[PDB]
Design a protein around this nucleic acid. Sequence first.
DNA 1: CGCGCGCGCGCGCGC
DNA 2: GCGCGCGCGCGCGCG
Lengths: 404, 403, 402, 249
Amino acid sequence: ATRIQAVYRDTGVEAYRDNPFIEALPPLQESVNSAASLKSSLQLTSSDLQKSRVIRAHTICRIPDDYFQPLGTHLLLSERISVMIRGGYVGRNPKTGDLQKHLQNGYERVQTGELETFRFEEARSTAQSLLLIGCSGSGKTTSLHRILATYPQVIYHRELNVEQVVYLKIDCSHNGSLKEICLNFFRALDRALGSNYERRYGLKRHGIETMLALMSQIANAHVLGLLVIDEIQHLSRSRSGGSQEMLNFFVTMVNIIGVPVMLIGTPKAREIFEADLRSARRGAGFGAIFWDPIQQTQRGKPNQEWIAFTDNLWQLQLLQRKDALLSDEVRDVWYELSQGVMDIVVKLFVLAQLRALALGNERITAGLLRQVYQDELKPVHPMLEALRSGIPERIARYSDLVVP
Amino acid sequence: ATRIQAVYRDTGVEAYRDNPFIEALPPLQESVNSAASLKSSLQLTSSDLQKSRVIRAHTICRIPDDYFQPLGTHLLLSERISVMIRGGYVGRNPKTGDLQKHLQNGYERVQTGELETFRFEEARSTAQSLLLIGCSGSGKTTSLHRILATYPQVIYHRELNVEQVVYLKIDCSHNGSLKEICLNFFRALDRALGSNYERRYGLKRHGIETMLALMSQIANAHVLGLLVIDEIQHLSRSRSGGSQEMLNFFVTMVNIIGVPVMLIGTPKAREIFEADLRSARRGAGFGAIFWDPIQQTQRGKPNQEWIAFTDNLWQLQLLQRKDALLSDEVRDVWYELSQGVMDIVVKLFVLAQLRALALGNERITAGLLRQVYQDELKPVHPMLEALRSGIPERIARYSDLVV
Amino acid sequence: RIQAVYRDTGVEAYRDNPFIEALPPLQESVNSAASLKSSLQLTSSDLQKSRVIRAHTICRIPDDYFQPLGTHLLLSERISVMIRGGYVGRNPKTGDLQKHLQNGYERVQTGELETFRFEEARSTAQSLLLIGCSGSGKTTSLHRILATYPQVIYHRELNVEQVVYLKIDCSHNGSLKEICLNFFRALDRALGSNYERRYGLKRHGIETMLALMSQIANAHVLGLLVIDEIQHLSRSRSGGSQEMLNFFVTMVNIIGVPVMLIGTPKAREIFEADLRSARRGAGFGAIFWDPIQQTQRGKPNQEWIAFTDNLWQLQLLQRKDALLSDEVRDVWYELSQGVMDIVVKLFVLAQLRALALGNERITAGLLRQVYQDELKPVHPMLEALRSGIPERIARYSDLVVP
Amino acid sequence: TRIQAVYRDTGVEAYRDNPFIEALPPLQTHLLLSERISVMIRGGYVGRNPKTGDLQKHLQNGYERVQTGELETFRFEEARSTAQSLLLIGCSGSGKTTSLHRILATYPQVIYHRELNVEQVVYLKIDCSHNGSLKEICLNFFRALDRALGSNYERRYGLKRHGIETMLALMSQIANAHVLGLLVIDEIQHLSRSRSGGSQEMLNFFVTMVNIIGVPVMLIGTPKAREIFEADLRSARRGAGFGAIFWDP
DNA sequence: CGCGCGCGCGCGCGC
DNA sequence: GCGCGCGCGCGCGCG
Ligand SMILES: Nc1ncnc2c1ncn2[C@@H]1O[C@H](COP(=O)(O)OP(=O)(O)NP(=O)(O)O)[C@@H](O)[C@H]1O
Ligand SMILES: Nc1ncnc2c1ncn2[C@@H]1O[C@H](COP(=O)(O)OP(=O)(O)NP(=O)(O)O)[C@@H](O)[C@H]1O
Ligand SMILES: Nc1ncnc2c1ncn2[C@@H]1O[C@H](COP(=O)(O)OP(=O)(O)NP(=O)(O)O)[C@@H](O)[C@H]1O
Ligand SMILES: [Mg+2]
Ligand SMILES: [Mg+2]
Ligand SMILES: [Mg+2]
């Protein structure tokens, strides 16, 4: 563990009444205020602007890692993860030691008449699942990292020895194998938790069945509240024997041990989720969260969200000949070269900053944007010309590129 | 061993006379009375409307797991399970006591005397089997262990040193291999019965030959009353003739040990029980129960079942500006979207409450319903398009669906 | 090995990180490329020597003659930024941070604060792609770039050994078990160990041996991985071509070791299948190295002129002439047509032919003779570039259209 | 049969105090062939010299000098891989193999180093695949190696139930354990006379061996096998390190 | 501590 | 190009 002792404050939900695993997480935040906490930026003083060439380049190449502007779509994502984690613990409440008294009293009072029936079972799996699908570059990995960074990963409960783990992030196996997802599970858990599960069960020549049972044993021992699997699109194309095997193992994981599972991938992963009704409505239990590139124009006016995003990005420059205000003439060159894909915007900005910084004419203009677009982004050209064209036939040539 | 102390109360069935494992069970109930006791709803007070938005949203998200209304398809299933649990104990009663002198007298009056024929071994495997197949979302698991939770999971006798496991629910194996199904059996047993069978019998490199032997021995020791294997559709994975091995293991388990077995799956498992007459005959050894999406109009008059279901669901709204009664216009487009699937009719309601709650217009209308249908319930559309068309060629493209 | 010393850098975010301060100091781009200059030292006494000795000392020119071009200013900065940014997320920060976590936890749970951020640790790895023609010097250039940094550094304060770069290559049929054996071989060649013997000969699956690769690469914290010749992933059949890229994409996602991929334009189309195979194949841009053109504009290009003038000085002939005629240089580019390796080999073979013929003079006729006689399997593809035809050049995937 | 090494040097800058070079006889259309083979042997021996002494003193002195002093940069790992590979094209009955065997007959095949635990072999001539596959040329490597020197890799790794995978790593390991000066190969027609989609995989192995292992290889064939040296410039450029030698009467 | 048995996986050949 | 059959090696359990 990292030894975060647990402190118990009750919340306003009747279904979370006196649950030790629920009342140990940061309290229920409002929708607007929760997405405000995700706001991050890179700060630079006036002294850092009067620095030499190499230090400025090295500290300006840090923007993609630390700059982050929340979006309106995060208002919907944060609500789901709030109830996924908290809701899955409802059925996994450690029962009071006085449970047998109630059972025996009910049994003796139903046996002799005077009571029609009695519920002899309380524990039942509550866990569910969802599926967020978006084009590559939609900023889903970083968004999930920054949302989950608010939660403490592993805590400790003093009264009874459970070393609760809230979440752990893994990725799908490169060949779609099921006996490799367990090695990633062990590696991620013995990195996040303080243990050596990779040594004990990793190099031993156990079978597929006798190590899946081991992963299921670690997860119910330290209650896991969410397991997130990324790069699901690897199940597509060259899957070894099949993908339905891994899918229905995850289904068993959701239904039996009550650990909610969240799946992440590109819309190349819709080809594995539409073959029958079961593999679709069970693939997403809170529905899907389909993310799309941001558009320059709203229903009847330019999109203000992109305006705020572009302005806040444009404020972060280390060029001495910078222009404080941002014109529409050079703003419109961004969208005609980026099409709203959130990665290309920041990468083009950083690459243009480096080019201007090193060309000797440290002024950013519309010309440098296309000048650096035409050399340093060549292997991604044809996938964005299709988005520029807007014709569905040219868009549908690529599986990741979702038709509008 | 939760140590529920057994109490013996007599019943009215002649064949269930002085059975230790039948008299110590919940008493016989009428199916109409039994189905009425599955009713449940979310507990809401009037003051819950004046609460924080987040708390109200979290309260709404608990609807899918607490609201449950019994339909007309629960009478038959309740009756079948109530007979199937309790008919398998006639051929396993350890009430046999001093059976030496009676057999000796019979032998010594058959070897010489007027008795042409006497019968000695009256033990029989009285078990049966069921096959419950329905659409993915009809409520097989929920209704199954809401019905089956009126029975105590484990009952203990001390006059006879036996621990009785009345039922045990296990899922199938992901790859259709008998090696994984015993690990699930042991985990379910030691997760319900307090014990440690998983480490003792599961991580040693025992072959498949002896692990099944240990499983049979343990199931016979604890007089298991019902084994329910869920997700039986997983056997379509083993297309190298590996489903026959798993099927005949359960057939053997019914013929000798005597535990009744229940099979549950989507209609994609219908390709399993059609290779020969034996599979189909024993797949439904006491009938088969097939479920379908609930229909809006059974006849010219509207169906009262769906009307009652949707009216009872409509009263669980924490939106403040709520309509007093459920309008016919929004009701007719409620079926038009879910098409009778019991999971989607509730998920649409929950997600529309969450959408109107976040948007600020705390009221449910048809337009918002279709907005939520298009935006968020996206991957399930082609199957619902096929169900909306009504033509057989569209439906005969997905294996899960039944015409 | 190297015993670490700690010198602070100018960057505010590269501060207190042991794996960054141990590296050489941040240098400017002008002196980074200028310091990467090599030549062979000669004396006037070598004029009177034997033919065999002269031939053996002039055959060494391609090995130790390196004049930086104008493109190296970008490559040096790119590699330095990648190496120093790889270690940003891989910094030991669990020194006394436990009390900070507990204080923040009790402040968020009970007090007035809400927006605490546990576990600032993450991955900051980005990928680079270098695609150029076979002869553009994309291998010896990278060798000279990373010859500046020490291979492995031993840090005394904690028993951790750091290796900053590792050089492997894709081989044969684009299988992952190629690169596990290659990875172990390179790692235990650079750092004296027996990793290949401990893990190679054993009967091990692909997915179990990749985990050992990941574990050992995370033990000796690796700041860069170079996979040269990724053109072997193109003609290779089955589902291995996409799965090797899958492995390299997930290597820069969890472990954090940045990956740089080097190939020829034959492997230009291994990425063009999808969007994710292209964005995740060039993180900080992709560098395409075109061959030297005769004129950058209406005026002649000074890069080629400087190259020829500096390369001309490395001659050892009795009747040698320091000056060179314009006719000599004009046919020099005509025969080779932009590809630098062919230039240096044509020069050295012409010098060898002149030395052994008995005529101690270099002339354009001898250059044409050594072009025709020796470079027989090289010219049928140089003809397309010499003729300047778009389709003739576009016949092959080895050479880009312009 | 192995002979002791007599280290006699000559007035050359590149070859100096490197035991793998001065353990060879004195340096002083067949003239070009002999000169080319000699220079590849010695240049390939250059890039693998373990003649270094107290590197750690020098390396740490340079590190400390760069970290604080006025010296710009220090060039760590001055260890290259000097390998070159020509193509030899000529008809089978012309007599190319006669000159080949005459030139490689001049130098001793295997020599002995006593101060170092290395017994390097100057040349190692295997024949190309008769059926045509990746495996048999590497088995041929074991057979030629154990014919050259008293060895038993034919039993340990020749017919051992391994794959096409681990055999290659062992072959490279035993190649650079006794560093080869030349890997000369004849009859390259059957490389692509028959195939299974893997005609260029053997050339991929050759390129990898002349990149990391650092052994200069030689390829010999009749004008039939020129098809693979025409498809793309990577194979065409690497197919002629010092330039191809087409044989004429 | 040595030998016997079984099981898991890897490679080659056949369809 | 994929599935099945065989063979090889390793590990644990018992006397
Ligand atoms: N909300 C955001 N604000 C600013 N930059 C962002 C945001 N989201 C993503 N980025 C940038 O997007 C780049 C990488 O996006 P990333 O999150 O890796 O894509 P991804 O879809 O989540 N993973 P992948 O499957 O490879 O596309 C980085 O440069 C981030 O700075
Ligand atoms: N009578 C009912 N009243 C209320 N909700 C119901 C009813 N029947 C089913 N549901 C809901 O339908 C959803 C599906 O439940 P579930 O138990 O998964 O059925 P299922 O058929 O086993 N799904 P699957 O295992 O994939 O076939 C749940 O959200 C239940 O709450
Ligand atoms: N800057 C340079 N100045 C002089 N010669 C150079 C230079 N760069 C490369 N060369 C020549 O190129 C040789 C090595 O580069 P080269 O073999 O072409 O690598 P590469 O072909 O680009 N990488 P690859 O084709 O994937 O193996 C050197 O020995 C030189 O002869
Ligand atoms: Mg991602
Ligand atoms: Mg179910
Ligand atoms: Mg190279």
